[PDB]
Design an enzyme around this catalytic site. Structure first.
Site, PDB file in Angstrom:
ATOM      1  N   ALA B  10       0.801  -1.174  -0.094  1.00 13.98           N
ATOM      2  CA  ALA B  10      -0.064  -0.026  -0.047  1.00 13.98           C
ATOM      3  C   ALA B  10       0.822   1.326  -0.002  1.00 13.98           C
ATOM      4  CB  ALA B  10      -1.062  -0.208   1.243  1.00 13.98           C
ATOM      5  N   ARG B  21       4.371   8.768 -12.272  1.00 11.37           N
ATOM      6  CA  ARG B  21       3.346   9.577 -12.933  1.00 11.37           C
ATOM      7  C   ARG B  21       4.032  11.074 -13.006  1.00 11.37           C
ATOM      8  NH1 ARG B  21      -0.702   6.704 -11.183  1.00 11.37           N
ATOM      9  NH2 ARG B  21      -0.951   8.043  -8.936  1.00 11.37           N
ATOM     10  N   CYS B  42      -7.169  -6.372   3.734  1.00 10.95           N
ATOM     11  CA  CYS B  42      -8.242  -6.361   4.514  1.00 10.95           C
ATOM     12  C   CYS B  42      -9.311  -7.219   3.971  1.00 10.95           C
ATOM     13  CB  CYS B  42      -8.958  -4.891   4.026  1.00 10.95           C
ATOM     14  SG  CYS B  42      -8.730  -4.416   2.599  1.00 10.95           S
ATOM     15  N   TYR B 425     -31.770  14.835   5.881  1.00  8.49           N
ATOM     16  CA  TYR B 425     -32.746  13.984   6.330  1.00  8.49           C
ATOM     17  C   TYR B 425     -33.893  13.687   5.529  1.00  8.49           C
ATOM     18  CZ  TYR B 425     -36.989  12.947   9.041  1.00  8.49           C
ATOM     19  OH  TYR B 425     -38.110  12.685   9.298  1.00  8.49           O
ATOM     20  N   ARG B 441     -26.371  18.408  21.773  1.00  7.59           N
ATOM     21  CA  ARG B 441     -27.424  19.348  22.347  1.00  7.59           C
ATOM     22  C   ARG B 441     -27.253  18.995  23.981  1.00  7.59           C
ATOM     23  NH1 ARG B 441     -33.035  18.890  19.267  1.00  7.59           N
ATOM     24  NH2 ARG B 441     -33.782  20.674  20.949  1.00  7.59           N
TER      25      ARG B 441
HETATM   26  C1  LIG Z   1     -44.978  15.017   1.854  1.00  9.86           C
HETATM   27  C2  LIG Z   1     -43.837  15.871   2.635  1.00  9.86           C
HETATM   28  C3  LIG Z   1     -42.707  15.178   2.491  1.00  9.86           C
HETATM   29  C4  LIG Z   1     -41.612  15.934   3.483  1.00  9.86           C
HETATM   30  N1  LIG Z   1     -40.325  15.343   3.478  1.00  9.86           N
HETATM   31  C5  LIG Z   1     -39.386  15.798   4.272  1.00  9.86           C
HETATM   32  C6  LIG Z   1     -38.040  15.426   4.248  1.00  9.86           C
HETATM   33  O1  LIG Z   1     -37.893  14.018   3.721  1.00  9.86           O
HETATM   34  N2  LIG Z   1     -36.957  16.064   4.947  1.00  9.86           N
HETATM   35  C7  LIG Z   1     -37.371  17.142   5.277  1.00  9.86           C
HETATM   36  O2  LIG Z   1     -36.296  17.691   6.034  1.00  9.86           O
HETATM   37  N3  LIG Z   1     -38.567  17.828   5.089  1.00  9.86           N
HETATM   38  C8  LIG Z   1     -39.460  17.249   4.557  1.00  9.86           C
HETATM   39  N4  LIG Z   1     -40.719  17.867   4.259  1.00  9.86           N
HETATM   40  C9  LIG Z   1     -40.993  19.315   4.721  1.00  9.86           C
HETATM   41  C10 LIG Z   1     -41.029  19.391   6.238  1.00  9.86           C
HETATM   42  O3  LIG Z   1     -42.381  18.793   6.716  1.00  9.86           O
HETATM   43  C11 LIG Z   1     -41.387  20.797   6.367  1.00  9.86           C
HETATM   44  O4  LIG Z   1     -40.080  21.625   6.142  1.00  9.86           O
HETATM   45  C12 LIG Z   1     -41.278  21.305   8.053  1.00  9.86           C
HETATM   46  O5  LIG Z   1     -42.797  20.831   8.355  1.00  9.86           O
HETATM   47  C13 LIG Z   1     -41.612  22.849   8.093  1.00  9.86           C
HETATM   48  O6  LIG Z   1     -42.129  23.309   9.479  1.00  9.86           O
HETATM   49  P1  LIG Z   1     -42.759  24.471   9.683  1.00  9.86           P
HETATM   50  O7  LIG Z   1     -43.056  24.525  11.198  1.00  9.86           O
HETATM   51  O8  LIG Z   1     -41.758  25.817   9.077  1.00  9.86           O
HETATM   52  O9  LIG Z   1     -44.226  24.574   8.715  1.00  9.86           O
HETATM   53  P2  LIG Z   1     -45.285  23.345   9.145  1.00  9.86           P
HETATM   54  O10 LIG Z   1     -44.705  22.172   9.342  1.00  9.86           O
HETATM   55  O11 LIG Z   1     -46.025  23.530   7.636  1.00  9.86           O
HETATM   56  O12 LIG Z   1     -46.072  24.013  10.153  1.00  9.86           O
HETATM   57  C14 LIG Z   1     -46.920  25.335   9.862  1.00  9.86           C
HETATM   58  C15 LIG Z   1     -48.135  25.439  10.747  1.00  9.86           C
HETATM   59  O13 LIG Z   1     -48.614  26.608  10.690  1.00  9.86           O
HETATM   60  C16 LIG Z   1     -50.368  26.365  10.546  1.00  9.86           C
HETATM   61  N5  LIG Z   1     -50.783  27.771  10.040  1.00  9.86           N
HETATM   62  C17 LIG Z   1     -50.565  28.266   8.825  1.00  9.86           C
HETATM   63  N6  LIG Z   1     -51.036  29.614   8.807  1.00  9.86           N
HETATM   64  C18 LIG Z   1     -51.604  29.691   9.835  1.00  9.86           C
HETATM   65  C19 LIG Z   1     -52.410  30.642  10.385  1.00  9.86           C
HETATM   66  N7  LIG Z   1     -52.819  32.044   9.869  1.00  9.86           N
HETATM   67  N8  LIG Z   1     -53.056  30.946  11.564  1.00  9.86           N
HETATM   68  C20 LIG Z   1     -52.483  29.570  12.369  1.00  9.86           C
HETATM   69  N9  LIG Z   1     -51.795  28.616  12.013  1.00  9.86           N
HETATM   70  C21 LIG Z   1     -51.544  28.735  10.756  1.00  9.86           C
HETATM   71  C22 LIG Z   1     -50.236  25.415   9.682  1.00  9.86           C
HETATM   72  O14 LIG Z   1     -51.531  24.713  10.142  1.00  9.86           O
HETATM   73  C23 LIG Z   1     -49.158  24.431  10.172  1.00  9.86           C
HETATM   74  O15 LIG Z   1     -49.419  23.456  11.055  1.00  9.86           O
HETATM   75  C24 LIG Z   1     -41.809  17.296   3.817  1.00  9.86           C
HETATM   76  C25 LIG Z   1     -42.891  17.724   3.515  1.00  9.86           C
HETATM   77  C26 LIG Z   1     -44.114  17.175   3.123  1.00  9.86           C
HETATM   78  C27 LIG Z   1     -45.348  17.893   2.720  1.00  9.86           C
HETATM   79  C1  LIG Z   2      -6.583  -9.282   8.197  1.00  2.53           C
HETATM   80  C2  LIG Z   2      -6.335  -7.782   8.078  1.00  2.53           C
HETATM   81  C3  LIG Z   2      -7.298  -6.755   7.775  1.00  2.53           C
HETATM   82  C4  LIG Z   2      -7.127  -5.499   7.845  1.00  2.53           C
HETATM   83  N1  LIG Z   2      -8.285  -4.683   7.490  1.00  2.53           N
HETATM   84  C5  LIG Z   2      -8.232  -3.421   7.330  1.00  2.53           C
HETATM   85  C6  LIG Z   2      -9.212  -2.601   7.104  1.00  2.53           C
HETATM   86  O1  LIG Z   2     -10.431  -3.089   7.297  1.00  2.53           O
HETATM   87  N2  LIG Z   2      -9.106  -1.396   7.119  1.00  2.53           N
HETATM   88  C7  LIG Z   2      -7.906  -0.841   6.908  1.00  2.53           C
HETATM   89  O2  LIG Z   2      -7.768   0.442   6.718  1.00  2.53           O
HETATM   90  N3  LIG Z   2      -6.666  -1.556   7.297  1.00  2.53           N
HETATM   91  C8  LIG Z   2      -6.967  -2.894   7.329  1.00  2.53           C
HETATM   92  N4  LIG Z   2      -5.678  -3.796   7.374  1.00  2.53           N
HETATM   93  C9  LIG Z   2      -4.335  -3.122   7.484  1.00  2.53           C
HETATM   94  C10 LIG Z   2      -4.021  -2.814   6.074  1.00  2.53           C
HETATM   95  O3  LIG Z   2      -3.982  -3.958   5.431  1.00  2.53           O
HETATM   96  C11 LIG Z   2      -2.592  -2.228   6.496  1.00  2.53           C
HETATM   97  O4  LIG Z   2      -2.527  -1.099   7.153  1.00  2.53           O
HETATM   98  C12 LIG Z   2      -1.800  -1.963   4.987  1.00  2.53           C
HETATM   99  O5  LIG Z   2      -1.567  -3.106   4.228  1.00  2.53           O
HETATM  100  C13 LIG Z   2      -0.355  -1.424   5.498  1.00  2.53           C
HETATM  101  O6  LIG Z   2       0.409  -1.057   4.249  1.00  2.53           O
HETATM  102  P1  LIG Z   2       1.836  -0.930   4.202  1.00  2.53           P
HETATM  103  O7  LIG Z   2       2.296  -0.754   3.016  1.00  2.53           O
HETATM  104  O8  LIG Z   2       2.411   0.093   5.263  1.00  2.53           O
HETATM  105  O9  LIG Z   2       2.558  -2.313   4.631  1.00  2.53           O
HETATM  106  P2  LIG Z   2       2.156  -3.831   4.255  1.00  2.53           P
HETATM  107  O10 LIG Z   2       0.786  -3.643   3.386  1.00  2.53           O
HETATM  108  O11 LIG Z   2       2.311  -4.895   5.136  1.00  2.53           O
HETATM  109  O12 LIG Z   2       3.381  -3.959   3.008  1.00  2.53           O
HETATM  110  C14 LIG Z   2       4.687  -4.057   3.388  1.00  2.53           C
HETATM  111  C15 LIG Z   2       5.549  -4.751   2.555  1.00  2.53           C
HETATM  112  O13 LIG Z   2       6.970  -4.939   2.882  1.00  2.53           O
HETATM  113  C16 LIG Z   2       7.443  -6.042   2.564  1.00  2.53           C
HETATM  114  N5  LIG Z   2       8.736  -6.013   3.327  1.00  2.53           N
HETATM  115  C17 LIG Z   2       8.601  -6.215   4.768  1.00  2.53           C
HETATM  116  N6  LIG Z   2       9.947  -6.163   5.145  1.00  2.53           N
HETATM  117  C18 LIG Z   2      10.688  -6.340   3.960  1.00  2.53           C
HETATM  118  C19 LIG Z   2      11.960  -6.253   3.776  1.00  2.53           C
HETATM  119  N7  LIG Z   2      13.093  -6.448   4.775  1.00  2.53           N
HETATM  120  N8  LIG Z   2      12.499  -6.322   2.385  1.00  2.53           N
HETATM  121  C20 LIG Z   2      11.774  -6.561   1.545  1.00  2.53           C
HETATM  122  N9  LIG Z   2      10.475  -6.409   1.833  1.00  2.53           N
HETATM  123  C21 LIG Z   2       9.983  -6.363   3.127  1.00  2.53           C
HETATM  124  C22 LIG Z   2       6.295  -7.099   2.960  1.00  2.53           C
HETATM  125  O14 LIG Z   2       6.580  -8.363   2.369  1.00  2.53           O
HETATM  126  C23 LIG Z   2       4.988  -6.289   2.484  1.00  2.53           C
HETATM  127  O15 LIG Z   2       4.481  -6.920   1.418  1.00  2.53           O
HETATM  128  C24 LIG Z   2      -5.778  -5.018   7.787  1.00  2.53           C
HETATM  129  C25 LIG Z   2      -4.857  -5.996   7.772  1.00  2.53           C
HETATM  130  C26 LIG Z   2      -4.962  -7.282   8.116  1.00  2.53           C
HETATM  131  C27 LIG Z   2      -3.697  -8.202   8.162  1.00  2.53           C
END
Ligand SMILES: Cc1cc2nc3c(=O)[nH]c(=O)nc-3n(C[C@H](O)[C@H](O)[C@H](O)COP(=O)(O)OP(=O)(O)OC[C@H]3O[C@@H](n4cnc5c(N)ncnc54)[C@H](O)[C@@H]3O)c2cc1C
Ligand SMILES: Cc1cc2nc3c(=O)[nH]c(=O)nc-3n(C[C@H](O)[C@H](O)[C@H](O)COP(=O)(O)OP(=O)(O)OC[C@H]3O[C@@H](n4cnc5c(N)ncnc54)[C@H](O)[C@@H]3O)c2cc1C
Ligand SMILES: CC(C)(COP(=O)(O)OP(=O)(O)OC[C@H]1O[C@@H](n2cnc3c(N)ncnc32)[C@H](O)[C@@H]1OP(=O)(O)O)[C@@H](O)C(=O)NCCC(=O)NCCS
Ligand SMILES: CC(C)(COP(=O)(O)OP(=O)(O)OC[C@H]1O[C@@H](n2cnc3c(N)ncnc32)[C@H](O)[C@@H]1OP(=O)(O)O)[C@@H](O)C(=O)NCCC(=O)NCCS
Lengths: 444, 444
Positions: B10, B21, B42, B425, B441
């Site tokens: 690596a 390069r 890995c 979200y 928070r």
């Molecule tokens: C189908 C759908 C999917 C959505 N999906 C997402 C999502 O995935 N992710 C995301 O972040 N957001 C999503 N939203 C948007 C999110 O729901 C709104 O941005 C959020 O509800 C806004 O909050 P708010 O309090 O500003 O307004 P609202 O929640 O609309 O509340 C305003 C309130 O004021 C009241 N009101 C209005 N005028 C008056 C008045 N004159 N007098 C008294 N009360 C009044 C209404 O009755 C209402 O309850 C989605 C919205 C919809 C419709």
């Molecule tokens: C089972 C396992 C799972 C792992 N999982 C993850 C993972 O999920 N995520 C992650 O980020 N990392 C993971 N790692 C670690 C990652 O594989 C190593 O950190 C990475 O290979 C390190 O790279 P490196 O080049 O420094 O060393 P190495 O990849 O060990 O390469 C060093 C090379 O030097 C050679 N060498 C050593 N001494 C000499 C010498 N005296 N003369 C000539 N050649 C020599 C060796 O033959 C070797 O090929 C894992 C490692 C193992 C073993």
């Protein structure tokens, strides 16, 4: 001491919990339009597919716990219709009785999220035409599936929700078509990466129609077809997923500044331009670490982060929001699709000089059983080599890679520095050089 | 121009490829004691288990490829027995014919790795008593398994190799015992995290013996029992995995500096204290990002990085090695075991003041099907809150978390900054707050 929060979900209740935990004197009133607090919208497509038992499983904390355990005055069926920022009064309508209530505030949080958009198409209101946002929305989709013979499903739009729902209907054994919007081409994935998505769709018999414009949903009492500028196709259930709009219409007349799409501008501390008014979540803007501009990328992770920060900041526990990276992940059939930071469309739109590296690789040691292909692309700055974004597509180990890329973007790392990180390796998990590092090495 | 490299795996060949390069004129001679270049040590436990078809699969590049394609004068069966650093001459003995050859160098790299240690036990040499390092080693284990009737296997030692091999023999259907060294307790995992490993081994009927010392291996021509200071146990095959020694023996007499265990000291640039002599990989010391001292953590990720760096520096393309984090990951039965940075033993030994946070969580949204438990522990400085290390154990999503933690450590992040990263979200992948962030928070 009097805190009022509008919106009863991710952002609003993340804020509520902070206030309640860190100010024992606090009087917290939360105003929610529907009947359900704190639920995971993200679980919706998985309840519909049957992967999750029921919508009740998506509830993270109920209104009873908020009230009884935490002393929050949590209201349901209260829709706020007006805020007076000078008198510091919030006006809410009871959604059933329509009686008007008013709530005095010392600090106010707007946490009203976005709503899915329904374009003004003939047939919009036909039974079986659906939007997906709320638990009742998911129940209405299930009700359509239960009480009808659904075999053909059409999805309008793509993105995360469209793709997740395509999978969901495929898994329910439907024949799925999706009609994609060209304004949304390149917005999430570059074209060379989206190719893997088209391939995966095609493989599972999901018909994707490109460069075709919807014009009407057809039917008597129910949908039975979707008409486009190029044909008319049978559909027994239509899901519309074409865009979202911040729920900020009610603030007209307050002077609270909004971006072009209506999302409320917030500074580092979740504050609007209007004294003692805050915003957080899908209704607010989202400072972007890499764009260095306030973007709008509504997702639940950002919503929870901003809601929590807004609560801390409303208590004067000053803490800046560091930003969003535009991270997103999708399960689509056999693939996981992830992206973070800038893609090419975003980098070009910003005039940031960039190059890309793309690697077709594997998720682990190629000699290890069930190593799967992994496609990964990085963008980086031409001059400084700062990492700009990444897209990762494959079957396993995609979330790991995008999270590592997210971490690198967060830390403003140069692409070649990724070569130096001591990431984990064993044969069942990776190769001795991670795909990210092999891509990094090919960069200039 | 004359580059000599000792070791053909690596580190050595990573160096070779850089030189080749980037220097058209270079005369590269590599000296390898065995007959196999560039193979994945890995993969060896996975060849033995049958998961990989043969040892041939583990070869990354042929000596024939190094010679023909790359022009490297790659020698096999050449064991270096001494180096004259004044005359600049390397002396190698052919391992078969015993003939001695001299190789003159301008720059020399030592890349000789470590060797597994066989303590001086009676019975060391019995057939069926095995070390595991090389492809020939794995072949010999397979030979034992193919011929001999193996029912009981004992493993002496633990660590990654002992654990992977316990799994390998379980999967081959053997009754596996492990006898563990108490000098290695807490060196990798803290005691509270090692508990999960003992439970998992016990669950799969791997008998682990603690505080018990090997005495002898017993048998006739082949091994048949292992004797300790507390009993004698049937064993038809013994794997010894108790420690490694740098292969640096041959350098006695040079002035090349070595740490207490014989690993060669290298500066930032892979240079020894001796002019024009370099080292890399398992035979060298490893600067530790968090300890800030030259450690010895021999692993393949580090060997490839150091070998590549050694090649670069030998060409005067000056580049510093940023260090190791002590990252490690192991598949063990149903569990994935990961760690990076400092554990408690390491933090205590260094007198770094630290606290810990431990979270029992899940890999994803708890309501999502097949969410699995995930155990995660972080250490952080009690003063500055610098993240110091993490250990993660569970069935899925462990590699993702350790890589995110590794990235945080590399960037010297405070634990609470993790709360601010836009990690991915969706329900199939995570919770809205990642377990790392929920643990962050809880920290002070
Ligand atoms: C189908 C759908 C999917 C959505 N999906 C997402 C999502 O995935 N992710 C995301 O972040 N957001 C999503 N939203 C948007 C999110 O729901 C709104 O941005 C959020 O509800 C806004 O909050 P708010 O309090 O500003 O307004 P609202 O929640 O609309 O509340 C305003 C309130 O004021 C009241 N009101 C209005 N005028 C008056 C008045 N004159 N007098 C008294 N009360 C009044 C209404 O009755 C209402 O309850 C989605 C919205 C919809 C419709
Ligand atoms: C089972 C396992 C799972 C792992 N999982 C993850 C993972 O999920 N995520 C992650 O980020 N990392 C993971 N790692 C670690 C990652 O594989 C190593 O950190 C990475 O290979 C390190 O790279 P490196 O080049 O420094 O060393 P190495 O990849 O060990 O390469 C060093 C090379 O030097 C050679 N060498 C050593 N001494 C000499 C010498 N005296 N003369 C000539 N050649 C020599 C060796 O033959 C070797 O090929 C894992 C490692 C193992 C073993
Ligand atoms: C449910 C919800 C209110 C979370 O409330 P929360 O109290 O902030 O979250 P938790 O109940 O997990 O408690 C977290 C706090 O308790 C602390 N804590 C939790 N367990 C602890 C323990 N065992 N020991 C010490 N502290 C602990 C945490 O450190 C955290 O502290 P902090 O807030 O000061 O950082 C909020 O996330 C929500 O409404 N979500 C809606 C559902 C959703 O997320 N939707 C979007 C998904 S797309
Ligand atoms: C196999 C071994 C010789 C690697 O040699 P290598 O030539 O450095 O590796 P590769 O063949 O992947 O080539 C890498 C170089 O080619 C470049 N490259 C590869 N594919 C490329 C492509 N398609 N386009 C452009 N450049 C490319 C890379 O950027 C990289 O460049 P760099 O060295 O300047 O950073 C070495 O790792 C080894 O001997 N390993 C032993 C097996 C092992 O890893 N064991 C430990 C595992 S535990």
């Amino acid at each position: 001491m009097n805190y009022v929060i509008i919106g009863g979900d991710a952002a609003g209740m993340s804020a509520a919990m902070q206030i309640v935990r860190n100010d024992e004197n606090a009087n917290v009133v939360t105003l929610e339009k529907g009947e359900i607090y704190s639920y995971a919208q993200c679980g919706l497509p998985y309840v519909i597919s049957g992967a999750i038992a029921s919508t009740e499983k998506l509830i993270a904390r109920n209104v009873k716990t908020f009230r009884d355990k935490y002393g929050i005055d949590a209201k349901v069926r209260h829709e706020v219709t007006k805020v007076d920022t000078e008198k510091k009064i919030v006006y809410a309508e009871h959604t059933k009785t329509k009686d008007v209530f008013e709530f005095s505030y010392d600090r106010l949080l707007i946490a009203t999220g976005v709503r899915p958009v329904m374009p003004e198409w003939e047939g919009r209101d036909l039974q079986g035409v659906h939007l997906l946002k709320t638990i009742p929305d998911a129940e209405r989709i299930l009700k359509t599936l239960e009480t009808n013979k659904v075999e053909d499903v059409t999805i309008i739009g793509g993105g995360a929700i469209g793709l997740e729902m395509a999978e969901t209907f495929v898994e329910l054994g439907k024949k799925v078509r999706m009609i994609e919007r060209n304004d949304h081409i390149g917005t999430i994935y570059d074209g060379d990466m989206a190719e893997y998505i088209y391939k995966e769709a095609d493989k599972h018999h999901i018909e994707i129609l490109t460069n075709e414009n919807v014009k009407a949903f057809k039917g008597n009492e129910r949908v039975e077809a979707v008409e486009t500028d190029k044909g008319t196709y049978k559909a027994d259930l239509v899901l519309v997923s074409v865009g979202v709009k911040p729920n900020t219409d009610f603030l007209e007349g307050t002077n609270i500044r909004t971006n072009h799409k209506g999302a409320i501008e917030v500074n580092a501390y979740m504050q609007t331009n209007v004294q003692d008014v805050y915003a957080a979540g899908d209704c607010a803007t989202h400072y972007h670490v890499i764009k260095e501009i306030h973007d709008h990328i509504p997702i639940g992770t950002t919503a929870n982060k901003q809601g929590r920060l807004a609560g801390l900041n409303m208590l004067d526990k000053r803490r800046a929001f560091k930003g969003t990276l535009g991270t997103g992940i999708i399960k689509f059939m056999n693939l996981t699709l992830a992206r973070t930071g800038l893609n090419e469309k975003e980098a070009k739109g910003l005039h940031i000089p960039y190059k890309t590296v793309k690697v077709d690789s594997t998720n682990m040691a190629g000699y290890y059983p069930n190593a799967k292909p992994l496609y990964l692309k990085l963008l980086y700055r031409s001059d400084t080599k700062q990492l700009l974004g990444g897209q990762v597509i494959g079957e396993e180990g995609v979330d790991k890679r995008i999270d590592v890329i997210a971490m690198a973007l967060f830390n403003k790392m140069s692409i070649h520095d990724l070569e130096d990180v001591d990431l984990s390796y064993a044969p069942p998990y990776n190769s001795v050089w991670d795909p990210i590092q092999q891509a990094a090495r090919r960069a200039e």
